[PDB]
Curated annotation (Swiss-Prot):
Its main location: membrane. NCBIfam families: MG289_thiam_LP. This is High affinity transport system protein p37. P37 is part of a high-affinity transport system. PROSITE patterns: PROKAR_LIPOPROTEIN (PS51257). The keyword Iron does not apply. GO terms for cellular component: plasma membrane. It is found in: Cell membrane.
Length: 333
């Protein structure tokens, strides 16, 4: 018997990926009293992964939490919630109506600016091979993440960007240039979009409508490349992306003027971290076994894949509605 997983590689996962599956296979064969070999295909996009499983081309994969449902007819079942190590200034899940999104960003700025990213060192900033450990609370796992909005520019520009924000003047704000991702990206499009609807009120048309209405004021820009394109001084990213983006001696997260600033304006509402889904072509017993093997590797610190992509733990999902859907509903409505 043989299974097929879909897997994404980040950092140096590829150097240990084969052994991880040799291990996984071993443990799965033990649990199931059978010789079972687990192969993998490398796949990046959640919708391809989901489509593969629904097409009986794959048995298991981790996918964006907002891309799935728990539905008897879908051909897969949500199996495990991935967990990630909390960031220091964000141990607790909360929303815009809790007032802490901007203030959490401010606290994080304190840790992040001095020293500046470009001077970060593997030893001083405690690079683990996957992340700069000085930004995390290793004794704490959480099941959520957020988007963040980075801003950059001269000292007076940064003051004008913040001014526009606090006054809730959308047209003034957008005129600084906004860098985004694909329209189906939570961190680089949807979460920022939702945050604006909550923050800006009437004057907000929605992000896509704004882009159509004034294309020159928007562009696709990665957070790590902010400042590179003048004309775009506001950029969306996964919250605290610099934490797992290794500074290697232009530098990332670094303006093209040493006098210019770069900081986090605010965070977005939260979303659940990725979820492992499993094919319904497998018996419930096989499904649970797969899930347990992940949980157990994490508990024994023998998981050599998870951490490479921010999966520092796992837990079983027992009530998807309560544990997933109701959480997502507070962010998306
Ligand atoms: C160590 C590490 N931490 C976080 C990420 C980014 N990431 C991986 S899965 C996920 C949630 C769904 O987007 C995010 C933000 C990474 N690549 N590596």
């Amino acid at each position: 018997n043989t299974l097929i997983f879909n897997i994404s590689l980040d950092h140096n996962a590829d150097t240990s990926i084969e052994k991880f599956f040799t291990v996984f296979s071993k443990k799965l064969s033990g649990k199931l009293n059978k010789k079972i070999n687990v192969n993998f295909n490398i796949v990046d996009d959640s919708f391809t992964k989901i489509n593969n499983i629904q097409a009986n081309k794959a048995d298991f994969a981790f996918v964006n939490s907002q891309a799935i449902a728990s539905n008897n007819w879908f051909g897969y079942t949500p199996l495990i919630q991935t967990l990630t190590t909390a960031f220091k200034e964000d141990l607790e899940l909360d929303y815009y109506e809790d007032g802490n999104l901007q203030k959490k960003a401010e606290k994080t700025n304190l840790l992040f600016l001095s020293p500046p990213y470009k001077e970060w060192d593997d030893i001083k900033q405690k690079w683990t091979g996957n992340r700069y450990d000085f930004l995390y609370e290793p004794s704490k796992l959480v099941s959520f993440y957020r988007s963040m909005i980075l801003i950059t520019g001269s000292a007076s520009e940064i003051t004008a960007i913040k001014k526009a924000w606090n006054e809730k003047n959308w047209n003034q704000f957008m005129k600084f240039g906004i860098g985004h991702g694909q329209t189906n990206s939570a961190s680089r499009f949807e979460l920022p979009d939702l945050l604006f609807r909550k923050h800006f009120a009437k004057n907000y048309p929605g992000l896509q409508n704004a882009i159509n209405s004034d294309p020159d004021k928007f562009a696709v820009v990665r957070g790590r490349e902010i400042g590179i394109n003048k004309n775009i001084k506001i950029v969306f990213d996964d919250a605290n992306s610099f934490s797992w983006t290794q500074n290697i001696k232009r530098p990332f997260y670094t303006p093209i003027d040493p006098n210019d600033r770069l900081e986090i304006l605010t965070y977005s509402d939260p979303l659940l971290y990725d979820i492992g889904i499993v094919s319904n072509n497998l018996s419930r017993i096989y499904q649970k076994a797969i899930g347990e093997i992940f949980i157990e590797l994490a508990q024994s610190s023998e998981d050599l894949y998870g951490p490479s992509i921010g999966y520092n733990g796992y837990k079983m999902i027992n009530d998807f509605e309560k544990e997933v859907v109701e959480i997502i509903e507070k962010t998306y409505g």
